[PDB]
């Protein structure tokens, strides 16, 4: 049952996310819109983290690589070091 990775972000899980966000009713097109958006977000952050990974000459993306990339994208995260 070959399935895309982005599709592993499923309807019910997007629907939960929305609920945490206070959303009551959701149109069928939201799920595909949401995946597009999540992909863009992960591209942007991962690119930066990986660029830190490469700079330090590692093969392993660290929590610090991610944290530092979140910081420069204006998405400071507390909880994972730094």
């Amino acid at each position: 049952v070959l399935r895309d990775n982005i599709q592993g972000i499923t309807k019910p899980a997007i629907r939960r996310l929305a609920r945490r966000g206070g959303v009551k009713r959701i149109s069928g097109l939201i799920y595909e819109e949401t995946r597009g958006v999540l992909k863009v977000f992960l591209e942007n952050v991962i690119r930066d983290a990986v660029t830190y990974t490469e700079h330090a000459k590692r093969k392993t993306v660290t929590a610090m690589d991610v944290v530092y990339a979140l910081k420069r994208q204006g998405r400071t995260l507390y909880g994972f070091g730094g």
Partner: protein
């Protein structure tokens, strides 16, 4: 033979997921998506376990708040149903 009205369960779920703080996307499908995306920038990559977690916390925080703004955009248009145009407006005004 018993059915809740459309919107009652939705409310019940809003109350429930605002009470709690667990991540709402399954870890593995998230892990694959991350790895798939990173592959376009570097081949043969490992990820610390905490690295992938940090990324999930951030993506979920981001998607939840965008759903808030989106919801405000739907309400502005005098609706209660969120649509792609609401998400799009929210992203446009955030400067994304």
């Amino acid at each position: 033979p018993h059915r809740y009205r459309p919107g009652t369960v939705a409310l019940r779920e809003i109350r429930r997921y605002q009470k709690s703080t667990e991540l709402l996307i399954r870890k593995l499908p998230f892990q694959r998506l991350v790895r798939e995306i990173a592959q376009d920038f570097k081949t043969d990559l490992r990820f610390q376990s905490s690295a992938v977690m940090a990324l999930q916390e951030a993506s979920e925080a981001y998607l939840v708040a965008l759903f808030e703004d989106t919801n405000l955009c739907a309400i502005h248009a005098k609706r209660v149903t969120i649509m792609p145009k609401d998400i799009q407006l929210a992203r446009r005004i955030r400067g994304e």
